[model samples]
Target: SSEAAAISEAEAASGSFGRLHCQVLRLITNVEGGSLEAGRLRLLDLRTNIEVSRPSVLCCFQENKSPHDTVDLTDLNIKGRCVVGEQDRLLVDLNNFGPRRLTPGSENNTVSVLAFALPLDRVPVSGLHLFQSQRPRMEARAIIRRTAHHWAVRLTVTPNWRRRTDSSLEAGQIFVSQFAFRAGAIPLTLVDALEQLACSDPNTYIHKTETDERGQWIMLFLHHDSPHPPTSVFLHFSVYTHRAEVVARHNPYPHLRRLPDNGFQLLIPKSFTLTRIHPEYIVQIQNAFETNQTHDTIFFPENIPGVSIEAGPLPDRVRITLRVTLTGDQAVHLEHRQPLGRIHFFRRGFWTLTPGKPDKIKRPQVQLRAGLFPRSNGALTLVIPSWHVFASLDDLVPLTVSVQHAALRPTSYLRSDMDGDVRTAADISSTLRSVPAP
Candidate 1:
């Protein structure tokens, strides 16, 4: 099974401007004619005089080493070879020799089948020439035109790549199996590159981080009957921060990227940052972007944690909004300035109403929770996790709070009164400050 002819054909096709495939079959060399065995027969593109297929061995014996004394009905083996060439090199099927038989006392014509392909633009007066590889003389020549009823089908590369994290392995990262084959509109799972197939070659398995193709698999087209042939193809995908259910604020739609026949060679972006438009949130991933070849949904499962907004009690809404925006870059930058690095303050008078009937204008409640965290130098400070609350403008309520920071339990280190004034450890009167709202 030498691919010498195929290798030569691919090279020849690439070197030329256009190309196609030629199917040559049924080689009936005269036994009483010139010596044919111990050599090979070649189909050539007459224009460039280039061999279209690997030189196939010329023999008179069957696959079982028997002479052509009888026909083997189960013989599905291609006695001929196919070639990839320009639009019109030569397409010859030498089977119809007009009613001939293979017997001991009859004809001396031997029978074998091989085929090939060629390419070019369009040459109306094109013809085919068959010759022996060693000999310079042509054996047969005929006028062959392009075959009708053959539709052109263009193909695009669908990169089925997946990234997985496995803590058990040293690399901690593995590329999941993309797909072995495709069904009608559905991708059926198959063995991964890390799996061992039964009765298969040992060198076939791929490495854990191997992401691209080692070699391309090209599908051939036989005598035509298929329809909806492809002319061009492209790709599309959306950049989501992670497996979040929130709406994408930046570049929500997929951008189409087209590729050539030989495929693309550019590196795809892995790191992506995005923001949420619903709850004023932001997130970033080092490399969690997922791409699809055929049709697929935008966000998938469990790439990273994401936020969701749902109905809850009045207090739950306060914590939800505060917690959601606390993870933002803006909020983190502000909290870093505090001594204990706590998110104690929020934007003044910033709130949204619930998604219900607007009849009563019910005011949501305002609440505060405080906690203490120890520092490295044996010092701790009371930190209010969040000072923001959801409430209506007319909802005026009484405020009273006190905190003791020193050992002696004498008086208050910090206190809040109904007059909206906060007294610090020195009894300095001050008020809460606000930051830009998200």
Candidate 2:
């Protein structure tokens, strides 16, 4: 019984905890005088040997060709992998094989390429002459091919008015927010499919993609190449409003209605980067304060991997960390301490703010230790005996102070009948003087 009690006490003193370790590994092999190729993704963990499963497993190379051997790339499980003629090519699906987990410490950094493996029976052997085989098991190595994924951005505009009176306008009344599209000095190019229909200048692409009877939509598509992907793009454009002017024809008595042209510069929003991960612009700024780096300017760089919209490199710096205020009516205004300026969206639309980091509570994982309280003031006053080492004041569990040897008298609750008094140093001095010198 004593031994069991001691074991239970030890178990209560020691807190239980554990951690899991996961790792991503890649497989590579060369075949048919070609460069080293990555293995196709087999998706299965266990190998033929029946040990711990490995990622990017390789397939066996076969020497003979069989016309009966058939593999369909149209399977939905294959993603975008396609079979061309006699050769089967499986492009690395960035969705499936994208950066599995973020690189150890960095938030933005991710691995674009992942490990892959293919089955030996499905691999085509038209080009390779010899089959490299394993002793007992007929295993051949298969390679996972890599390809470029195209990216495009479209800007669509629809006509609408914020004022209530404008909604009452007749069907014949032609009203629209006149605006010209402007593309920044980026490495992205305009689409060539319907170039003849739309007039695309050096820095502008003004055209309507789809228009009904009364066309008021201004739509355009911009794309980037694979060579050098851009980190972000600027949506710098201008907006114009309709104005009516009365003019005299020849005689001063007669007048004609004239439509005058006037416009003002406007930016939809400052800029946008091609990434699903929320930009840590504010977090990095706070880190700057912690790191004591006040003078250094932080600029958003252009060379983010696997994203679109490449701007030309003449004016390389795009300043960020500027204070921005979100106002009502779907507009974001930027200003300094004084009166810098404001950028407003002409039309109302849906905007989203990425959620911040979750404040997770700490698990009570420590063992209580015997120690003197810090506020003991050099005296032998001990800390209260606690069941757990740590606790949150906001937690649901009520913490009680266990005082030892307080049950000498009858167990009866005492009512608070005494008046509260605030003591002072003068009172303490008088009491100390009254005490006998010992």
Candidate 3:
């Protein structure tokens, strides 16, 4: 769909205050009647304005699977032509709506169950809900752009934007961010954009690399969500480099995720020149590195069920029930609901003075779990916690898990120690909380 026309309005509206592409400002158009109590566009054919007081409906497609522009049941306008039923009021699913990500147009015109959000913020705007009615709506995008070794991120601020907002927004600064759907693994403070990525990647098949979403993920968020624009509306991600890395990175999803090893590499620049002796990377000759270590002990939070092991998604206890056997072996026994996963499973392997613990081997049913453990790249680097040991502990011996949260790498304590100095791991959770950490 030509996001150009509709996005133009958002851009034009912002244009008054400044030229487009100002601050790469996030555009948020509230949709009323649809899921959002607030509404934006009128679904042309439905005549029936959708009601999504609770809000944004989403769907995932292989063409460009972005959790940002996803759809659920309520997001649909029940009375719209899109819904049909001599049996009952049922919503037709997405792919059935059109070819996988059908081109947005008239001849191929099809209805899209979409989403909407507040204007000042950005958090997956139907980043959504785009359909090309006689008018426009929203859409799902799977883009494979080149990941630059050096990027030129530019922000655009509308000079007149201040006049448009009243006292409420007057106090508001450009509450901006990046919707890095299928983004890189760089840290937040290092880059100008962040969308606090949503962790709902669905795998439709085999594990390992088969259904891999790739370790390529990251983002940040503020109040609401939306990326405003049509082409040159504002913020732009460009290139800035003396020499290219040869070519750009491209990811093609059999589903909506990039396969292992094939992902958008971090675009941020590296200031330090290597102190090493070779380009192909025979680091052992220079200083030192792996297999030479094992974590001193498990490093899970205080709230988890087993102080002995890691298990959680937060409040700490949301994982498969953990059973510490008579043999002191650690095994997962499903108790209540199937929650929590891999990130926590990175806990050090089950350690016992006597190493003969029986392997439960049979993990909880795949359906009742919340994760995975495979190499993002064909081999492992630091993208994992106990990376060097991932294979030995996970698939091979099947002791620990490959659970990961957000996009991260193993603590390259070695690399960080290369300067012949040690650094304590940052308390990411405690430090990241809204309140100050002790």
By lDDT, the best candidate is 1
| Regions of candidate 2 where Cα sits further than 4 Å from its true position | 1-114, 117-193, 196-201, 213-438
What lDDT does model 1 reach?
Answer: 0.20
Reference-based lDDT, residue 293, model 3: 20
**Please, what is the TM-score per model?**
0.15, 0.13, 0.15
lDDT of 1 by residue, 1-438 (tens): 478988986565322112221221111222221221211211111111123222211111111112122222221111111122222222111121223422232543333221111111111110000101110111112121222421111223332334566442233444432222111211112211111112122212222111112221111111111122122222111111122221111111111111222111111122222253333322211211111211111110010112111111112111112122311223222111111101111112222222232411211111112222222113222221222112221221111111112111233132222222211122211111122232
Q: Report, for all candidates in order, the number of backbone clashes.
A: 36, 12, 61
Question: Model 1, residue 97: what's the lDDT?
Answer: 21
Model 2 per-residue lDDT tens digits across residues 1-438: 799999987554331211111111111111111111122221211111111122111111110112222222211111111111122112222111332322222332211111112111111111101111121111112121222422122333332222222211122122222232322221112211111112122322222222111232223323221222233233322221111111111111001111112111112122322123432112001011111111111111111112211111111122212322211112222211221111111111111111231311111101111122222112211111211111111111111111112211233121110010100010000000111111
Which is the winner by lDDT between candidate 1 and candidate 2?
Answer: 1
Q: Worst lDDT window (10 residues) for model 2? A: 423-432
RMSD of 1: 43.7
Q: Per-residue lDDT of 1-438 in model 3, one digit per residue for the tens?
A: 577888966655332211211101111111122121111112222111112222111110111012122122122121111111111111211112212321222232322221111111111110111111120111112332345453333333221111122121212222222232333333322332211122221221111110112333322111211223122123333322222111111111111121122111111011111112311110000001111122111112111111112221111212122221110012223221121121111122422121232321211110011111223423211111111111222121101111112212243111112121111121111001111121
RMSD from true fold, candidate 2? 34.0
